[PDB]
Amino acid sequence: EKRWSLEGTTALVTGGTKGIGHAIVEELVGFGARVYTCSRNEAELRKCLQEWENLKYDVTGSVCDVSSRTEREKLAEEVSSVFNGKLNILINNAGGYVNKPIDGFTAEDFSFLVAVNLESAFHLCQLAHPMLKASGTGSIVHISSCCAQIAIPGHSIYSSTKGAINQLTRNLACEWAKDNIRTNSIAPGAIRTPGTESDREVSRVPFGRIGEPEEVASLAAFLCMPSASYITGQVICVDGGRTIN
Amino acid sequence: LEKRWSLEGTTALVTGGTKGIGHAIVEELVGFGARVYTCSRNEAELRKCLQEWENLKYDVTGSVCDVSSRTEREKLAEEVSSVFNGKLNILINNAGGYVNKPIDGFTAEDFSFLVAVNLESAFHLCQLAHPMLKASGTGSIVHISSCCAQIAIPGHSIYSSTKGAINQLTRNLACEWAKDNIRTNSIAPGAIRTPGTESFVIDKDALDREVSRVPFGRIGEPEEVASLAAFLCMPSASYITGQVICVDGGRTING
Amino acid sequence: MSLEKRWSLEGTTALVTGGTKGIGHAIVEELVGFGARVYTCSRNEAELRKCLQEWENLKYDVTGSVCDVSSRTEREKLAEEVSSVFNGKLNILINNAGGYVNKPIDGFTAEDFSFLVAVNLESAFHLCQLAHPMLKASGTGSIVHISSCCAQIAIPGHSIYSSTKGAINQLTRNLACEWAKDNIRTNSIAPGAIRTPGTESFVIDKDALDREVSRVPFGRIGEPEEVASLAAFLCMPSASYITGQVICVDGGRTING
Amino acid sequence: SLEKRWSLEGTTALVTGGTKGIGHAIVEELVGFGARVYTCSRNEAELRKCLQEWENLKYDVTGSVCDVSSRTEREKLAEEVSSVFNGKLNILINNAGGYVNKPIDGFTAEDFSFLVAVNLESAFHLCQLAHPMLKASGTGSIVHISSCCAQIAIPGHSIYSSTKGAINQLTRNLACEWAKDNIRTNSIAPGAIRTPGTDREVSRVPFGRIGEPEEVASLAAFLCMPSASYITGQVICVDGGRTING
Ligand SMILES: NC(=O)c1ccc[n+]([C@@H]2O[C@H](COP(=O)([O-])OP(=O)(O)OC[C@H]3O[C@@H](n4cnc5c(N)ncnc54)[C@H](OP(=O)(O)O)[C@@H]3O)[C@@H](O)[C@H]2O)c1
Ligand SMILES: NC(=O)c1ccc[n+]([C@@H]2O[C@H](COP(=O)([O-])OP(=O)(O)OC[C@H]3O[C@@H](n4cnc5c(N)ncnc54)[C@H](OP(=O)(O)O)[C@@H]3O)[C@@H](O)[C@H]2O)c1
Numbered sequence A: 001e002k003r004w005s006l007e008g009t010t011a012l013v014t015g016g017t018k019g020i021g022h023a024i025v026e027e028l029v030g031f032g033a034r035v036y037t038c039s040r041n042e043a044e045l046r047k048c049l050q051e052w053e054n055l056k057y058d059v060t061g062s063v064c065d066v067s068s069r070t071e072r073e074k075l076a077e078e079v080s081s082v083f084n085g086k087l088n089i090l091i092n093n094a095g096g097y098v099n100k101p102i103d104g105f106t107a108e109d110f111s112f113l114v115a116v117n118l119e120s121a122f123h124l125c126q127l128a129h130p131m132l133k134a135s136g137t138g139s140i141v142h143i144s145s146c147c148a149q150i151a152i153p154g155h156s157i158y159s160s161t162k163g164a165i166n167q168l169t170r171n172l173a174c175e176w177a178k179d180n181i182r183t184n185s186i187a188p189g190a191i192r193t194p195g196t197e198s199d200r201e202v203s204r205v206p207f208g209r210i211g212e213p214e215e216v217a218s219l220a221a222f223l224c225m226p227s228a229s230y231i232t233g234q235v236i237c238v239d240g241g242r243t244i245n
Numbered sequence B: 001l002e003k004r005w006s007l008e009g010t011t012a013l014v015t016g017g018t019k020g021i022g023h024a025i026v027e028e029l030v031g032f033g034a035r036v037y038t039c040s041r042n043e044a045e046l047r048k049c050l051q052e053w054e055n056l057k058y059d060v061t062g063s064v065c066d067v068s069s070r071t072e073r074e075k076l077a078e079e080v081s082s083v084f085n086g087k088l089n090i091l092i093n094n095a096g097g098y099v100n101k102p103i104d105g106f107t108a109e110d111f112s113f114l115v116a117v118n119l120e121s122a123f124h125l126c127q128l129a130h131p132m133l134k135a136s137g138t139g140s141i142v143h144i145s146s147c148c149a150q151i152a153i154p155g156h157s158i159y160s161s162t163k164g165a166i167n168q169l170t171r172n173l174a175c176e177w178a179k180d181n182i183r184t185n186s187i188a189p190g191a192i193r194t195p196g197t198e199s200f201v202i203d204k205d206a207l208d209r210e211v212s213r214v215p216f217g218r219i220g221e222p223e224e225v226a227s228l229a230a231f232l233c234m235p236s237a238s239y240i241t242g243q244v245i246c247v248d249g250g251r252t253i254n255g
Numbered sequence C: 001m002s003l004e005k006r007w008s009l010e011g012t013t014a015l016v017t018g019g020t021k022g023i024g025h026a027i028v029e030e031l032v033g034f035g036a037r038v039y040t041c042s043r044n045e046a047e048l049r050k051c052l053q054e055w056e057n058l059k060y061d062v063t064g065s066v067c068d069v070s071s072r073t074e075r076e077k078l079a080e081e082v083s084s085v086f087n088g089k090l091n092i093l094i095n096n097a098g099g100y101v102n103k104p105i106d107g108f109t110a111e112d113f114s115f116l117v118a119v120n121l122e123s124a125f126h127l128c129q130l131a132h133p134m135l136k137a138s139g140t141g142s143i144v145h146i147s148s149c150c151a152q153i154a155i156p157g158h159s160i161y162s163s164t165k166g167a168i169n170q171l172t173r174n175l176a177c178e179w180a181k182d183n184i185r186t187n188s189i190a191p192g193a194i195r196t197p198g199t200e201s202f203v204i205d206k207d208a209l210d211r212e213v214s215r216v217p218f219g220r221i222g223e224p225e226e227v228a229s230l231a232a233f234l235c236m237p238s239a240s241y242i243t244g245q246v247i248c249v250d251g252g253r254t255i256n257g
Numbered sequence D: 001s002l003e004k005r006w007s008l009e010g011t012t013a014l015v016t017g018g019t020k021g022i023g024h025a026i027v028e029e030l031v032g033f034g035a036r037v038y039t040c041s042r043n044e045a046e047l048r049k050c051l052q053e054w055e056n057l058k059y060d061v062t063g064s065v066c067d068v069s070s071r072t073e074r075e076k077l078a079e080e081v082s083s084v085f086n087g088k089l090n091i092l093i094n095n096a097g098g099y100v101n102k103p104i105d106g107f108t109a110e111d112f113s114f115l116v117a118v119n120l121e122s123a124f125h126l127c128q129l130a131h132p133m134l135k136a137s138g139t140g141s142i143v144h145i146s147s148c149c150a151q152i153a154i155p156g157h158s159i160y161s162s163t164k165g166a167i168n169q170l171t172r173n174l175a176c177e178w179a180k181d182n183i184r185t186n187s188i189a190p191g192a193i194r195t196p197g198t199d200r201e202v203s204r205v206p207f208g209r210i211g212e213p214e215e216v217a218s219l220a221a222f223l224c225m226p227s228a229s230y231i232t233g234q235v236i237c238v239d240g241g242r243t244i245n246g
């Protein structure tokens, strides 16, 4: 019973107002965690917390563009204050997406994706390291993507930033193991989110369907539990078999 | 949340369930509400296990089977079908065999043994279980592979090769049987505590060598493999198929 | 040292299994083209004698004997004959001979399984064991296994075939690490679909051909010399720091999405 | 014919960071097979000495000073190469890179921005600028120099390895999107190689030694030859077995 619980744990989830992030918030709360989340949109963030606070859920938030270093430093300080410098769980879920042929990418496109997909997760880990160490039971989960192992038209820079994230998972896993912190990455296939609302792909999925947000969030919760205590440095695809055909 | 993280009402077969990882898997599955069938080659051991599991009112049945034998695998599948009335939700291929020798030392008998017990047993049991898994409407196959199928550990050549074969077979199974709502995945453990016996002396120098290469600096416990096997069989793993997941404390990526 | 030395197989000896057609025949000719003395085999005496007669008329140094590499006694014999011809020194072992059965998983019999394991995996494993003294005595050894790119993806009908080739990919890593001390390197080449006599029935099957070719970014199947060139390169002194790798020769097939 | 497939006669090539280490070996390897090479470096003095060395050995090497971490210098570099080679480039070798060895905690914003610019955005933007001449050559070959540590965790390598992992993924996207233009793209992932950039690591190499620059340059040249015509999208480690040694 204790191996499969997150009771007494504190968690930060970037980009919890919609999509996968929102499902991760609810899954973690469902298992006993206290969650701090963020978004760039005050109104929806605000709405999201009212809902959760109606429902018994200890969720806290503030507006953060995790594409801003200054903002990131800001988020980390507030998180540290709320949780008194102890954090069990960091989920780097917030990201960005640009779909263009390689010829079409601009300098702004490139810096945009690198900042929100790679530099964001990296610096937040740096910022959260003291608090994760203080937890004595740290878990970092990055939301990667399955296209970091295959070539999908238009995904070049986006997949490259996600492939950098997968490697960073390895380095975090080994460097911070001595602080009892585990790091893993979840690589989703196509998931129905507000991000993706914005036949060819599904024809390539053996299950013949796109993913649901809870099919990703459930593994995010699992990787944070005591039952996952020997799983670290892994990249796990949640794609209905999409990458292997 | 409660429906997607439960195995209530499911049926499972776990090969080699008397000790170690296999034993932890059986009890993890029962813990989440499955009815479990298990086997072993040692009858005496198996009976004791069976007699015990009752008294903690766990729903576990079993029979003696050497999974390296084709005819014994067939008889196992028929008894499992009879016990579960032709409906199997879960197949855990955990039984295997280990021999460690320099490449030059392996004989024809070694090669035959390792391939039969590690690769053919899992392949043939998948074929035999396919009708039951399909009749269940929601199937989950988990192979217990090994993280040494991605790196070279001294003495592991044929053993690791059979596990690399299992990892590939996982992908073929995931794609071919998805249409039957069957998922197939592989768990690749690293160094896991070996259950002791009254008569075998464990090589502690070999154990220390592998544990020294784990970032975590410790050996894994059987429950740390069993937990992921149960999760992979839950409704909550519905979009996870064809994967090989290392449970090794960072062993394979530790440079 | 020099570029000309590092890109040459002058003075080497090599064994290529299954050299009478397809990829194996292209490898025999590629290795001869760079100066190697080659030994080869197949199961068919008439075809092998014909190849050997052609290679003499080309003044290529190729020797051969009949060998079914799925048989343990035949492999032992082959290794004794090779060691006699090359005076116990072998620079290069190319495990090219293989076999193929295409069925749904439910369809495979015990004989199908045994056939594929013996010719794709046990043949290579045992021939590496038998060749080890000669590879070490050459002072510079190179083992190349011909695997398959479908040991990383699921192709319908390929379950046992791909699994035996995945076993080869792992064995490559063990051989690379255990025998580095003997100055032997081991690598695997993993082709996508290649035009060979082995695939001729596939190529005639126009629906099966378009299905596979639609998945290759290059829009075509490969040719035997596109595999053989890399087999030759992996055996040269220029490949001195390349060991334990699995290299796909597949026109982008496996990473295409 | 064999002799035709194993050869780079008449090809044109750009190799970034050709004044030392692997890049220097790649320049000489490519010239050795008949290529005409354009290369570059941030250091004018050493670029001069290299160009003068190669001039005195009658190699066809041209060079200009360029910092590939700067967007504008990349565009200037691309236009000079198009002019020298009359708009046709057979070969692009993205070798120039940077290294910063620190624990994850120590990396600064400049360090991160530094490594991404020189290891990732450098190659990516240069690929776009080189695309018309590579297409115009009718036979294009892009080779990135990545690193074998993009598959394992080596202490101090966290950001460096991540940029090389991004390179490895970018190779796959390039290989698939530009196969239609008869351009192939592959990555070489060296282990420890004896260079000016460079017992704990050697004890983990099965061969028990670091590599030589020509042991990387050999493969770079092979991947540009017609013999490599069906090889694209691959990441090939040149590491003496280091990544697989357990
Ligand atoms: N859905 C898929 O198919 C798929 C596949 C592979 C990977 N992924 C990855 O999964 C993660 C989530 O995607 P999703 O599809 O669930 O996205 P989504 O539905 O678009 O939700 C994104 C969430 O992130 C927040 N967010 C976005 N940018 C942010 C920023 N710069 N700072 C702070 N918060 C930010 C968004 O709110 P604001 O805009 O209000 O800030 C929103 O709450 C991403 O890393 C994505 O790359 C998704
Ligand atoms: N072609 C492809 O598309 C493809 C793709 C991936 C991998 N591969 C692999 O590449 C290798 C060569 O294939 P291929 O297409 O070139 O085959 P192929 O055209 O059929 O030629 C095979 C050669 O091997 C010989 N051979 C077969 N079995 C043998 C045995 N048991 N003992 C001795 N010799 C034997 C054959 O001659 P006899 O029959 O007369 O013995 C023939 O010389 C195989 O390992 C194959 O699995 C091929």
Ligand SMILES: NC(=O)c1ccc[n+]([C@@H]2O[C@H](COP(=O)([O-])OP(=O)(O)OC[C@H]3O[C@@H](n4cnc5c(N)ncnc54)[C@H](OP(=O)(O)O)[C@@H]3O)[C@@H](O)[C@H]2O)c1
Residues within 6 Å of the ligand: D016, D017, D018, D019, D020, D021, D022, D023, D040, D041, D042, D043, D046, D066, D067, D068, D069, D095, D096, D097, D098, D099, D118, D145, D146, D147, D148, D189, D190, D191, D192, D193, D194, D195, D196, D197, D198
């Ligand atoms: N050697 C290894 O152990 C190893 C291992 C893995 C990967 N690698 C990779 O292999 C590649 C070469 O490494 P190396 O060790 O040969 O490095 P190196 O010896 O330090 O050589 C670097 C070369 O690149 C040039 N260069 C560096 N930054 C540049 C810039 N911004 N613009 C233009 N030129 C630049 C250098 O000249 P200036 O300073 O004059 O610009 C020099 O010519 C790098 O990508 C490295 O990441 C090397």
Ligand SMILES: NCCc1ccc(O)cc1
Residues within 6 Å of the ligand: B098, B146, B147, B148, B189, B190, B191, B192, B210, B248, B251
């Ligand atoms: N009993 C198998 C030996 C083994 C040890 C450690 C490891 O990571 C994988 C295999």
Ligand SMILES: NCCc1ccc(O)cc1
Residues within 6 Å of the ligand: C100, C148, C149, C150, C155, C191, C192, C193, C199, C212
């Ligand atoms: N040699 C088996 C034939 C084959 C192999 C691989 C592939 O992708 C397609 C066909």
